[PDB]
Design a binder for this molecule. Structure first.
Ligand SMILES: [Cl-]
Length: 142
């Protein structure tokens, strides 16, 4: 789990996906997967190519590997995420290790559009992710 949660109209986020997530992904009718995690952050971590193999059998038609680290997220990353969603079949599921990076890529864009920072944080929290430790960076994107 119950960690695949809605962050926006066409966007779910999640912690690291596993083969076992195929059923729920199919049930939600996910059409596009965005992975925001570099491969090989942890030994147990499935590589994106293998997630793609498992989930192509789950009705997902678009796959994008957009690796970032929370620390290194820049403007180029934020607008690349925005564009991938804009051109995607819906709904989109984005994941990283925890969903933090997905939520930040989303949230930096909302800040630019004028969403108040507290609202960004409240919305991400409603998708299971606490962005309180990024409050200052979020503010600076507005
Ligand atoms: Cl990578």
């Amino acid at each position: 789990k119950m960690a695949i949660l809605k962050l926006d109209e066409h966007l779910y986020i999640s912690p690291q996906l596993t083969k076992a997530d195929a059923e729920q992904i199919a049930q939600l009718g996910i059409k596009t997967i965005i992975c925001n995690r570099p491969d090989r952050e942890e030994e147990s971590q499935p590589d994106f190519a293998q997630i793609k193999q498992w989930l192509e059998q789950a009705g997902v038609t678009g796959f994008h590997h957009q690796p970032v680290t929370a620390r290194d997220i820049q403007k180029h990353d934020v607008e690349t995420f925005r564009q991938l969603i804009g051109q995607a079949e819906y709904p989109v599921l984005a994941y990283c290790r925890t969903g933090t990076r997905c939520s930040l890529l989303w949230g930096f864009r909302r800040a630019a559009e004028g969403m108040p920072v507290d609202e960004i944080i409240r919305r991400a929290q409603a998708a299971g992710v606490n962005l309180e430790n990024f409050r200052e960076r979020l503010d600076n994107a507005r």
